[PDB]
């Protein structure tokens, strides 16, 4: 159990609409890891004073609000579409497949 190869731990996951403010992004580990510590640093400097940090933190806040309102709008649209497609009925999962048996398999 203690010797099973070269390991690698768990990291930070990023909220995609506020990282790369508005515009679409791509994946890279170093950039996301930079952004997570960068915005905590800019928050501390903006609280201490420092108008250049206050600009960056306010711009991030603007993108954060816009993405959050867009995503709740998408939730409302999906709920309305589901209430149109089915009635007051709900969607039902597939049953689990256990393989063959000497039984009628929908018993």
């Amino acid at each position: 159990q203690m010797s099973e190869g070269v390991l690698k731990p768990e990291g930070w996951a990023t909220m995609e609409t506020v990282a790369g403010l508005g515009e679409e992004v791509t994946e890279d580990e170093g950039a996301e890891s930079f952004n997570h510590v960068y915005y905590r640093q800019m928050y501390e400097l903006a609280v201490a004073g420092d108008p250049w940090a206050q600009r960056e933190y306010a711009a991030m806040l603007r993108a954060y609000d816009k993405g959050c309102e867009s995503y709740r709008a998408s939730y409302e649209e999906a709920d309305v579409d589901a209430n149109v497609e089915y009635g007051v009925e709900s969607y039902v999962v597939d049953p689990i497949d256990f393989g063959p048996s000497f039984d009628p398999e929908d018993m």
Binding site: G20, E24, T26, D28, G30, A31, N35, Y38, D50, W52
Partner: peptide, 27 residues
């Protein structure tokens, strides 16, 4: 006085702009 804080803000802001920007990397 006050020089290292200004240089720190300028350096991490430039490092955010021209490196470590995922929209830049996407384009």
């Amino acid at each position: 006085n006050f020089v290292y804080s200004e240089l720190f803000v300028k350096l991490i802001k430039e490092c955010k702009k021209r490196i470590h920007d995922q929209t830049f990397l996407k384009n």
